[PDB]
Amino acid sequence: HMSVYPKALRDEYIMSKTLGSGACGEVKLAFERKTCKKVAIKIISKRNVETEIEILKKLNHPCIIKIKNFFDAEDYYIVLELMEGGELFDKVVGNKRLKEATCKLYFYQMLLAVQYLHENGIIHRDLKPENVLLSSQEEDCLIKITDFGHSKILGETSLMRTLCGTPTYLAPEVLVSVGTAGYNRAVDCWSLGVILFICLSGYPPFSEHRTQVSLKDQITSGKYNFIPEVWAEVSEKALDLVKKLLVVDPKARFTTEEALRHPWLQDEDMKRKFQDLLSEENE
Amino acid sequence: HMSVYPKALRDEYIMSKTLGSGACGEVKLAFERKTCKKVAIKIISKRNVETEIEILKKLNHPCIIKIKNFFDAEDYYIVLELMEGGELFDKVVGNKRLKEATCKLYFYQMLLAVQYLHENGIIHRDLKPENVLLSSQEEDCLIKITDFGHSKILGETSLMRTLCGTPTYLAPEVLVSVGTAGYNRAVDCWSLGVILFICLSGYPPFSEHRTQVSLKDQITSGKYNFIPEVWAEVSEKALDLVKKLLVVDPKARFTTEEALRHPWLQDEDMKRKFQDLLSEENE
Ligand SMILES: Nc1ncnc2c1ncn2[C@@H]1O[C@H](COP(=O)(O)OP(=O)(O)O)[C@@H](O)[C@H]1O
Numbered sequence: 001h002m003s004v005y006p007k008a009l010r011d012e013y014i015m016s017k018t019l020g021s022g023a024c025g026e027v028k029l030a031f032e033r034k035t036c037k038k039v040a041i042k043i044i045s046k047r048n049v050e051t052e053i054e055i056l057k058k059l060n061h062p063c064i065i066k067i068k069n070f071f072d073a074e075d076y077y078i079v080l081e082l083m084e085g086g087e088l089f090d091k092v093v094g095n096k097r098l099k100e101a102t103c104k105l106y107f108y109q110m111l112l113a114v115q116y117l118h119e120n121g122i123i124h125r126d127l128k129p130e131n132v133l134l135s136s137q138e139e140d141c142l143i144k145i146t147d148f149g150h151s152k153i154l155g156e157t158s159l160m161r162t163l164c165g166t167p168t169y170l171a172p173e174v175l176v177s178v179g180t181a182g183y184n185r186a187v188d189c190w191s192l193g194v195i196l197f198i199c200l201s202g203y204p205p206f207s208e209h210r211t212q213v214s215l216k217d218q219i220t221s222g223k224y225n226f227i228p229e230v231w232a233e234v235s236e237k238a239l240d241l242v243k244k245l246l247v248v249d250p251k252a253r254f255t256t257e258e259a260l261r262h263p264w265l266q267d268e269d270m271k272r273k274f275q276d277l278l279s280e281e282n283e
Numbered sequence: 284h285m286s287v288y289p290k291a292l293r294d295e296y297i298m299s300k301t302l303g304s305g306a307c308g309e310v311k312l313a314f315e316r317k318t319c320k321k322v323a324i325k326i327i328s329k330r331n332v333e334t335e336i337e338i339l340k341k342l343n344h345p346c347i348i349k350i351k352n353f354f355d356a357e358d359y360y361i362v363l364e365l366m367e368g369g370e371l372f373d374k375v376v377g378n379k380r381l382k383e384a385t386c387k388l389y390f391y392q393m394l395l396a397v398q399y400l401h402e403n404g405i406i407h408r409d410l411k412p413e414n415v416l417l418s419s420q421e422e423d424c425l426i427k428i429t430d431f432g433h434s435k436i437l438g439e440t441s442l443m444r445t446l447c448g449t450p451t452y453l454a455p456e457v458l459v460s461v462g463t464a465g466y467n468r469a470v471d472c473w474s475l476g477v478i479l480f481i482c483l484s485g486y487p488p489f490s491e492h493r494t495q496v497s498l499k500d501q502i503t504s505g506k507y508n509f510i511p512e513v514w515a516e517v518s519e520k521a522l523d524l525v526k527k528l529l530v531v532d533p534k535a536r537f538t539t540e541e542a543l544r545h546p547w548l549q550d551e552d553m554k555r556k557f558q559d560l561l562s563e564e565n566e
């Protein structure tokens with residue numbers, strides 16, 4: 001190497017192997033000396049994180065990753081609970097795929113995580129299979145949402161202040177924007193729709209392989225790639241929900257509440273399995 | 284009273300009479316003890332200003348107010364150069380009005396102030412006759428733009444980062460917003476158009492007196508109130524420029540550059556009077 005870990009980190013943790021990486025951070029296995037138990041440590045280079053640490057510290061939901069510690073050294077170190085089943089992405093690449101029952105169980109948890117975010121005024125903005133971690137290598141497991149590097153605290157207070165004028169001077173485009181203000185969170189429901197599409201079908205709804213119509217043009221028209229042969233194996237209920245999340249109008253798009261009330265999620269077997277997994281954890 | 288001035292303020296300044304007030308701050312005459320010269324002190328109650336102080340300290344233009352000092356006490360105190368001719372508003376109320384020659388001189392300075400802001404990545408967002416101060420009680424004078432409480436540092440870096448995905452997951456409305464991103468500054472050109480309309484005609488373009496069409500509906504349609512009798516006294520050139528600033532499409536709206544190149548502003552007499560006023564100041 002060309003470096004060492006900072007002394008404050010080394011004091012409390014024994015660092016181990018790489019668990020994963022992305023465009024922002026590399027994630028390492030470590031052992032916490034005090035408990036002798038495993039953690040994950042995300043390393044972020046300095047070349048904000050303040051806001052990501054702040055958001056993470058105040059969130060408390062079983063389907064959202066918890067922060068355990070933080071170092072502000074030559075790099076940033078974020079100590080996290082360890083997720084031993086890896087990424088959701090690993091379960092859906094090779095155009096391969098989950099059974100509908102486990103898509104439902106995993107998705108139900110995603111909806112709850114995201115619902116809880118939106119209730120607390122947070123938008124994730126980067127929901128993707130690589131940012132959904134599994135608890136164990138067992139198929140029926142708890143998932144957690146991770147990677148809050150792009151997330152925002154919800155607001156519109158700037159618009160609300162503008163509107164307390166004095167419109168004599170106010171530009172028309174500011175007044176036009178009032179029609180959709182406060183629907184930022186809907187980008188998360190779109191992302192959820194895409195993740196749900198992928199989990200059910202094994203393939204992405206919008207993609208450059210095939211087509212000729214630009215990826216952009218496919219997304220703004222909402223003309224996802226439907227392959228009947230692949231969807232025949234999936235219930236009508238599951239597809240109906242995908243359709244309601246992949247609506248181009250963000251005001252007409254399903255919210256996490258409307259998705260949780262969708263017929264697909266009225267599944268007592270799935271919900272009982274979720275509560276079962278929760279109680280196991282909490283010992 | 285129910286209060287005193289903070290000791291740090293009193294140490295350097297002798298406070299005097301109220302010069303003006305708004306929804307945010309009350310502005311007081313003061314004398315700086317060290318120079319025995321007059322200043323204005325804006326008092327802002329604590330119930331941000333950091334960002335307004337920061338923006339003001341880095342701006343250096345003859346048509347923009349300068350900050351001289353700052354106190355962060357039970358209230359905020361912003362010490363400013365004193366403008367002895369008051370607000371532009373005072374010259375245009377009572378549905379009364381300026382001669383076209385002085386509208387031009389004052390407007391030319393406004394365009395320069397705003398051009399300089401946009402070049403430096405700042406949008407004012409609250410341009411109005413009450414935030415344009417005159418240097419003296421003489422008609423031909425220097426104006427300064429003031430009141431940067433609503434101003435923003437220009438950006439889009441969030442969108443630019445979103446676009447460095449990974450559009451597989453990206454919501455259509457984010458992709459739609461790319462078409463107008465980076466035209467925030469255009470709200471200042473709209474405000475300038477309205478101020479110019481008022482200065483030339485004595486009356487506001489959008490107003491609830493008369494009409495029945497809602498103020499909002501008038502602004503978004505761009506159907507300003509044109510009274511021929513009032514505009515007959517104004518050149519065709521002046522009105523043409525108003526028309527180009529009061530365009531509802533912010534991408535087609537005149538920029539401060541296009542306005543400075545408008546035939547109305549190709550006036551060597553006006554420009555010579557401006558440079559004359561500048562050199563007087565700078566002694
Ligand atoms: N708490 C964790 N437990 C186990 N693996 C993790 C954990 N957090 C992240 N990882 C692995 O590291 C990868 C990158 O983490 P993430 O926070 O998404 O970084 P980035 O901001 O670079 O995308 C993840 O996709 C995952 O594979």
Ligand SMILES: Nc1ncnc2c1ncn2[C@@H]1O[C@H](COP(=O)(O)OP(=O)(O)O)[C@@H](O)[C@H]1O
Pocket residue numbers: 302303304305306307308309310323325348363364365366367369370413414416429430431432
């Ligand atoms: N530098 C100054 N010199 C003289 N008068 C001033 C000065 N600054 C402000 N004023 C007077 O005080 C009023 C309020 O100041 P401003 O900064 O616009 O406060 P607000 O944020 O409350 O609108 C102005 O409209 C003007 O009449």
Ligand SMILES: [Cl-]
Pocket residue numbers: none
């Ligand atoms: Cl809400």
Ligand SMILES: [Cl-]
Pocket residue numbers: none
């Ligand atoms: Cl530019």
Ligand SMILES: [Mg+2]
Pocket residue numbers: 022130131147
């Ligand atoms: Mg990630």
Ligand SMILES: [Mg+2]
Pocket residue numbers: 042078146147148149
């Ligand atoms: Mg994180």
Ligand SMILES: [Mg+2]
Pocket residue numbers: 305413414430
């Ligand atoms: Mg003001």
Ligand SMILES: [Mg+2]
Pocket residue numbers: 325361429430431432
């Ligand atoms: Mg100010």
